Amino acid sequence: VPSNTPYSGEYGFEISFQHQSKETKSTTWTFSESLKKLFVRMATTCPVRFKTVHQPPAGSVIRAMPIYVKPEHVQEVVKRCPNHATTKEHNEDHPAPTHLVRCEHKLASYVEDPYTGRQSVIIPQEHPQAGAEWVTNLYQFMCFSSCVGGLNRRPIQVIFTLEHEGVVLGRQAVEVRICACPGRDRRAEETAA
Ligand SMILES: [Zn+2]
């Protein structure tokens, strides 16, 4: 049972999403702060920002792992539907075509726990650039939330953990809905709530 409990930890690990102004905003993603929920199109690069208030130990990493939100689904591993996992589109030379969550980082490593089957992607933790508070990493989500035989309309979260040599040092999480029209789904979900 992977924990989703937010945890800044001793190093002050935090995530965020950059401001979107109407003039240059991407239509491929949008983040509802009131819902703590990312809306994003399938197979589009989505910017996620990370920081630590204090420098963590050398060689620390950041893991991204999707999990289902509701008790009725928590124990089931989140991964792509067989349809998308076995097609050739999106998958030419990918090392882990069944993983839902991908990261563009050059050193991204795709791992699967041999016992639980949990899939995640790990990248190095990095010092921000000069004068910058945040490091931006690019993720993609490789099925729609409605993929029959995959997510099948069940809600998911993505867990971000800062880790060093296996030990979780910090944790943040957001809900994620992968949909054709992030702005439309955000407005409608924010309206219903
Ligand atoms: Zn799919």
Numbering used by the authors: 4 to 196
The authors write:
To gain further insights into the evolutionary history of p53 and factors that govern the stability of p53 family proteins, we have characterized the DBD of a p53 homolog from the extremophilic annelid Alvinella pompejana, which lives in tubes at the edge of hydrothermal vents at the bottom of the Pacific. In addition, the A. pompejana homolog shares DNA-binding properties with human p53 family DBDs, despite its evolutionary distance, consistent with a potential role in maintaining genome integrity.
We determined the crystal structure of the A. pompejana DBD at 1.92 Å resolution. The latter is formed by a loop-sheet-helix motif and two large loops that are held together by zinc coordination. The zinc-binding site (Cys176, His179, Cys238, and Cys242) is conserved in A. pompejana. Intriguingly, A. pompejana has a similar large-to-small substitution at this position, F270V, but in this case, the crystal structure of the DBD shows that the substitution is compensated for by a small-to-large substitution of a neighboring residue, I255F, which maintains optimal packing of the hydrophobic core. The additional tryptophan-mediated hydrophobic packing interactions are likely to contribute to the increased thermostability of the A. pompejana DBD, and also that of the p63/p73 DBD, which is supported by mutagenesis studies on human p53.
